[PDB]
Design a protein around this ligand. Structure first.
Ligand SMILES: Nc1ncnc2c1ncn2[C@@H]1O[C@H](COP(=O)(O)OP(=O)(O)OP(=O)(O)O)[C@@H](O)[C@H]1O
Ligand SMILES: CC(C)CCC[C@@H](C)[C@H]1CC[C@H]2[C@@H]3CC=C4C[C@@H](O)CC[C@]4(C)[C@H]3CC[C@]12C
Ligand SMILES: CC(C)CCC[C@@H](C)[C@H]1CC[C@H]2[C@@H]3CC=C4C[C@@H](O)CC[C@]4(C)[C@H]3CC[C@]12C
Ligand SMILES: CC(C)CCC[C@@H](C)[C@H]1CC[C@H]2[C@@H]3CC=C4C[C@@H](O)CC[C@]4(C)[C@H]3CC[C@]12C
Ligand SMILES: CC(C)CCC[C@@H](C)[C@H]1CC[C@H]2[C@@H]3CC=C4C[C@@H](O)CC[C@]4(C)[C@H]3CC[C@]12C
Ligand SMILES: Nc1ncnc2c1ncn2[C@@H]1O[C@H](COP(=O)(O)OP(=O)(O)O)[C@@H](O)[C@H]1O
Ligand code: VO4
Ligand SMILES: [Mg+2]
Ligand SMILES: [Mg+2]
Length: 1133
């Protein structure tokens, strides 16, 4: 745990001043209650003197009406002071914490974006997102207003017992004798809670990785039907976190019960050993003041310990010093850079797998102003060489040089500025195309972007879009074709006009014609550029000034009722709310009942009967409180824990059942959904935990107090009851102004999560373009939006909290004035009635602090409304729907009958302008065409990700809209265009091919052998159990593709869909994979999409697609005889 006073590292002078003033006001508000104790003690002696003079009837000197007019004036002054002090106390403390938390978040995100690339290989994005969302929120909970409330309660407790020292002495000695026992207990309990919080936070962080990966790879999850297992993993992570919250609630519910018992038993000990009426009453009331105000301090200690744990978690990251510092200025920068790069005996190991030597004494020379082609098998280390030039890592031994200068002695920012890179399988950011291209150079005008698109061969298809250059590419570029994404990435790298170009397979997803068009300009710009391209095409390899071959590391040349819904939702927790409510009601009854009883025991001496009766009352009120406070604090915490895990599980389950179109909406980005999952459950828990116990306690206390008050004098009680409707008005008015704020803040909070996930998951791309500052500024500019509303919520909360206590004290002032009227004018023996009524009303003053539960009530209502809006949605394509046609014998016959389709996110241009094709069972169809003509769109129709608008897709003579989604998907095996893996072992990534059953390892090994993958996995430490990293990023692209092929093959599907399954492989491995795939596609229907036309000549049918329409259809020989578009496509390549 961190030091508690170390939570204020970010506090400035203004924060210190605010804390000082708020603490002074809290101290005054705390001493306000011993003042009312003194006033109550003074009135009793006056009554005793008046009663004795009446019953003896110094006569006529004292008049009760004037005396209690003075007392009412005292109470009114106390009310005004309490209003002022409470408002300032809450407002200043809430404002001070907000600035510190904002600085903490900005520092956290600014430090995270500075770490070296190797740091992210060991630290998941989901864990960082969960930290940023929830741990800083817990730190805020620790230091916002629980600190002010704890200061006030401690002041009241101290002044309550210190009053018994300065007056009515010889009884506080026993309290001093036991005070270390309270202090020692609260320290050990605080230690226990922090340790529990560490496990809770770790389990919650592990739960956020699963959700993030599933939401990012929903398309893969939906294709293989793994929603059930992903929900199971999420529940497994959540159950561990829920179990520790229960123990935290237990240990914090024992603390509250221990305090009451100890105080009351210690006073019972003090009274029995021992042996004016206005001193006994003060002592009796100080007992309950101390016990009640120590009991209510329990929520603050738990908040402090939770904040300490979250703070050590957050603070470890901020104080870390990165090995490779990009924003630092300790480096040299050259002038007139030639661009020559040289490797000198470079040996490299990856920090995640240090037992494997990726580069072994590698030596190359890359002459400036020439084209160098890196060729080699998958896994030879071609991608690692470029990352070393980028200085993402450093060689274990050896030296990388530019123009003869060591890479380690150069300014990092300048070096990465001089480099433009097209990463293998590029990634774009969620914005318009123009902004994505302008991410390279922010000083680029519109004509610069137009020229960049012209060189990237992107101008034509961009201008053929409904929103030219302003089309939204989507999350990661998902709402684009692979070739379009690649060409936009090429335009991004070319707009910088760099000296060094690193094209890692920059034409992988392009057809022959567009690849030739790109390569023409690439060969044209050679005089002023140093170009290094990883390539597989023979045409790319030729016309290259230098060819360098890689082999194993060596290189050689050549909604409407949120509360009612949650009340119906929390039904299975009735037993725990029943016992908790009983405990809270018993707790609320004793506080005014105690005041009533000690008035009876005092009445108006004896060692035998009076002392014993007082002592037994203390023992009973100690033991019963010990049990019932524990019951309340444990049962309500358990109910909250159960409710929040059910909320989280059901939200995750409901998210997975939505259609793919839902996941494509810009309001449903993966970051936003993860932020929804992480935060909306905690907010409902905050209102749904022990706060219901507090509310029940307060309501029962007030009800019992007024019940006893009405049974003595209904005339006086009506005055006090009349003030209560003011409490309902202010509380309802508080939530009314706060729900409007909570609606506007959640949108900003969700959009902040979008920025964090986008930047942290694409850190390699961000470092490649070198736009860390851009994302920092974007996150900062969106973090300020709730910050302006924070001060207004602080003012509203402070005013309502102060006004509640002000009304409580004004009620007593009015009651005193009315009693002054009543006793003098029309009253006999009424002095005792007013005494007991004032006693019970006085003792029912403090528990009206349930107004501090309210400021989170506005948040919980919005969170519940949003949770129930999603839980009720009915997707057009329901994977959870059990209704649909399911026939026994599946044959894999596919028919397209005049299919017309438009993407919902882009409804101004349809991508399938009538598509008619038929594949007989056992045949193979090869889809060929230009980049972006709709080949992948047709595949998504078969998987039922989308439904055709006009037309139908027929499977075995059945319309696809009437076929069961699960049944249809269980018979299809798909290799996506750029496949994504899960952060697990290789065996688990292969075993995902067939969920709902356990695949034996023999079948996994056979599938891996088929995909030409067994030798690579065998040559690794931890064979078949190596973690592949996030999205399979700790592997080469070819190995990831081969794992995907094995995953598709292992399930043995009736229909096999391959969407460019060799785009990352080299020719030598491609031939072996094709030979193995021929057996895979020998007894089943298959659809093949390929820009490599050497792998489709064996296909039964070759259909050429153009703008969503088939133009030619036939075999290889027939299509070459026609000299059509297929012949041109083959010839140009
Ligand atoms: N971040 C990483 N952590 C650990 N190992 C990695 C990481 N990135 C790559 N590797 C490993 O380094 C080796 C070299 O693969 P590399 O990524 O350099 O591909 P490549 O040889 O250029 O091939 P391809 O054509 O498939 O991209 C592989 O064994 C790969 O698993
Ligand atoms: C009136 C009595 C009873 C209570 C007074 C409490 C006040 C004076 C206390 C409570 C919280 C305290 C602050 C807590 C944190 C900070 C930041 C730290 O880096 C230095 C100390 C400093 C600046 C403290 C100054 C004193 C402080 C403001
Ligand atoms: C404007 C605000 C700050 C005024 C607040 C005044 C209050 C807090 C002060 C001012 C006068 C004070 C009272 C003056 C005299 C008596 C009688 C004495 O035997 C017991 C204390 C008692 C009952 C005092 C209690 C506290 C008191 C009521
Ligand atoms: C609108 C809601 C908040 C009701 C407000 C009632 C307030 C304003 C009223 C109710 C009882 C009133 C008090 C009753 C008796 C006296 C004694 C007199 O010698 C001085 C004024 C003083 C102390 C009054 C001040 C105003 C008072 C406190
Ligand atoms: C079910 C439990 C929790 C209910 C507890 C309510 C208790 C504290 C209340 C409810 C009704 C109350 C009684 C109402 C009327 C009378 C008569 C009066 O001359 C003295 C007080 C006395 C005797 C009250 C004592 C306290 C009392 C019994
Ligand atoms: N989810 C989507 N939302 C909107 N437009 C999309 C989406 N996916 C693809 N597109 C666009 O619609 C067209 C469909 O082409 P696509 O199927 O991606 O091409 P290809 O035939 O190369 O696989 C392209 O213009 C592409 O940019
Ligand atoms: O390279 V494509 O636009 O046919 O996925
Ligand atoms: Mg590579
Ligand atoms: Mg595609």
């Amino acid at each position: 745990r961190v030091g508690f006073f170390q939570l204020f590292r970010f506090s400035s002078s203004t924060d210190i001043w605010l804390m000082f003033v708020g603490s002074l006001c809290a101290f005054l508000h705390g001493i306000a209650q011993p003042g009312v104790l003194l006033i109550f003690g003074t009135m009793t002696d006056v009554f005793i003197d008046y009663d004795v003079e009446l019953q003896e009837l110094r006569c006529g000197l004292l008049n009760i009406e004037s005396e209690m007019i003075k007392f009412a004036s005292y109470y009114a002054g106390i009310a005004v002071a309490v209003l002022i002090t409470g408002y300032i106390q809450i407002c200043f403390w809430v404002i001070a914490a907000a600035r510190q938390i904002q600085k903490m978040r900005k520092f956290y995100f600014r430090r995270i974006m500075r770490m070296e690339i190797g740091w992210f290989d060991c630290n998941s994005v989901g864990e960082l997102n969960t930290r940023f969302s929830d741990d800083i929120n817990k730190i805020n909970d620790a230091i916002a207003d629980q600190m002010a409330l704890f200061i006030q309660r401690m002041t009241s407790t101290i002044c309550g017992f210190l009053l018994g020292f300065f007056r009515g002495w010889k009884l506080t000695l026993v309290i001093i004798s036991v005070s270390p026992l309270i202090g020692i207990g609260a320290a050990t309990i605080g230690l226990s809670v922090s340790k529990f919080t560490d496990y809770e936070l770790k389990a919650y962080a592990k739960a956020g990785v699963v959700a993030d990966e599933v939401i990012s790879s929903m398309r893969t999850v939906a294709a293989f039907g793994g929603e059930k297992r992903e929900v199971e993993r999420y529940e497994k992570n959540l159950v561990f976190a829920q179990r520790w919250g229960i123990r935290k609630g237990i240990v914090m519910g024992f603390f509250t019960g221990f305090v009451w018992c100890l105080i009351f038993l210690c006073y019972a000990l003090a009274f029995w050993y021992g042996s004016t009426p206005g001193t006994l009453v003060q002592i009796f009331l100080s007992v309950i003041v101390g016990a009640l105000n120590l009991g209510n301090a329990s929520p603050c200690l738990e908040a402090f310990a939770t904040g300490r744990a979250a703070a050590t978690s957050i603070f470890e990251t901020i104080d870390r010093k990165p090995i490779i510092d990009c924003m630092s200025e300790d480096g040299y920068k050259l002038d007139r850079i030639k661009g020559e790069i040289e490797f000198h005996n470079v040996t490299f190991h990856y920090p995640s797998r240090p037992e494997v030597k990726i580069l072994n004494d590698l030596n190359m020379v890359i002459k400036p102003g020439e084209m160098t082609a890196l060729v080699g098998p998958s896994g030879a280390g071609k991608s690692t060489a470029l990352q070393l030039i980028q200085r993402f890592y450093d060689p274990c031994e050896g030296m990388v040089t530019v123009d003869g200068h060591d890479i380690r002695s150069l300014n990092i920012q300048w070096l990465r500025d001089q480099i433009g890179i097209v990463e293998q399988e590029p990634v774009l950011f969620s914005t318009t195309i123009a902004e994505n291209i302008r991410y390279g150079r922010e000083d680029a005008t519109m004509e610069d972007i137009v020229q960049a698109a012209k060189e990237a061969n992107a101008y034509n298809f961009i201008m053929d879009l409904p929103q030219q250059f302003d089309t939204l590419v989507g999350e990661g570029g998902g709402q684009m074709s692979g070739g379009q994404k690649q060409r936009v990435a090429i335009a991004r790298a070319l707009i910088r006009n760099p000296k060094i170009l690193l094209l890692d397979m920059a034409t992988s997803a392009l057809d022959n014609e567009s690849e030739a068009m790109v390569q023409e300009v690439l060969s044209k710009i050679q005089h002023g550029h140093t170009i290094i391209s990883v390539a597989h095409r023979l045409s790319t390899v030729r016309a290259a000034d230098t060819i360098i071959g890689f082999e194993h590391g060596t290189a050689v040349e050549r909604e409407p009722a949120p509360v009612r819904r949650i009340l119906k939702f929390s039904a299975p927790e009735w037993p725990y709310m029943l016992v908790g409510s009983v405990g809270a009601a018993v707790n609320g009854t004793v506080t005014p009942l105690y005041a009533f009883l000690f008035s009876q025991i005092l009445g108006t001496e004896e060692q035998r009967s009076q002392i014993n009766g007082v002592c037994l009352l203390f023992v009973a009120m100690g033991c019963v409180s010990l049990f019932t406070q524990f019951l309340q604090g444990y049962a309500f915490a358990k109910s909250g824990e159960l409710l929040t895990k059910r909320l989280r599980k059901f939200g995750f389950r409901a998210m997975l059942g939505q259609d793919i179109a839902w996941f494509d909406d810009l309001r449903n980005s993966p970051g936003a959904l993860t932020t929804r999952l992480a935060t909306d459950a905690s907010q409902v828990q905050g209102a749904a935990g022990s706060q219901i116990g507090m509310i029940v306690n307060s309501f029962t206390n007030v009800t019992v107090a007024m019940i006893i008050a009405f049974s003595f004098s209904w005339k006086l009680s009506l005055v006090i009851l009349c003030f209560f409707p003011f409490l309902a008005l202010s509380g309802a008015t508080q939530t009314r102004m706060l729900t409007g704020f909570a609606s506007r803040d959640k949108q900003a909070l969700e959009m902040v999560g979008q920025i964090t996930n986008e930047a942290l998951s694409n850190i390699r791309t961000v470092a490649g373009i070198g736009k860390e500052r851009r994302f920092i500024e974007a996150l900062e500019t969106e973090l300020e939006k709730p910050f302006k509303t924070a001060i207004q919520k602080a003012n509203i909360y402070g005013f309502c909290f102060a006004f509640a206590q002000c009304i409580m004290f004004i009620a007593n002032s009015a009651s005193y004035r009315y009693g002054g009227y009543l006793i003098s004018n029309e009253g006999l023996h009424f002095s005792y009635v007013f005494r007991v009524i004032s006693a019970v009303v006085l003792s029912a003053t403090a528990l009206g602090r349930a107004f501090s539960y309210t400021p989170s009530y506005a948040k919980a209502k919005i969170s519940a409304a949003r949770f129930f809006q999603l839980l009720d949605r009915q997707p057009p394509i329901s994977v959870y729907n059990t209704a649909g046609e399911k026939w026994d014998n599946f044959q894999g016959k596919i028919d397209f009958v005049d299919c017309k389709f438009t993407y919902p996110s882009r409804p101004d241009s349809q991508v399938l302008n009538g598509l008619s094709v038929s594949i007989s069972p056992g045949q193979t169809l090869a889809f060929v065409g230009s980049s972006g003509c709709g080949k992948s769109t047709s595949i998504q129709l078969l998987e039922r990700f989308y439904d055709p608008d006009q037309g139908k897709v027929m499977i075995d003579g059945h319309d696809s809209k009437k076929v069961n989604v699960q049944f249809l998907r269980s018979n299809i095996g798909i290799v996506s265009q750029e496949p994504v893996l899960f952060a697990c072992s290789i065996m688990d990534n292969i075993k995902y091919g067939d969920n709902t059953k356990e695949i034996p390892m023999e079948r996994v090994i056979a599938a891996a052998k088929q995909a030409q993958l067994h030798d690579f996995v065998m040559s690794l430490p931890e064979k078949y159990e190596t973690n592949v990293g996030s999205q399979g990023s700790q592997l080469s692209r070819g190995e990831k593709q081969r794992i995907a092929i094995a995953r598709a093959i292992v399930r043995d599907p009736k229909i096999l869909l391959l969407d460019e399954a060799t785009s990352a492989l080299d020719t030598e491995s491609e031939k072996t994979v094709q030979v193995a795939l021929d057996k895979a596609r020998e007894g089943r229907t298959c659809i093949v999409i390929a820009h490599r036309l050497s792998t489709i000549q064996n296909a039964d049918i070759i259909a050429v697609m153009a703008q969503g329409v088939v133009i030619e259809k036939g075999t290889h020989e027939e299509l070459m005889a026609q000299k059509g578009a297929y012949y041109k496509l083959v010839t140009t390549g």
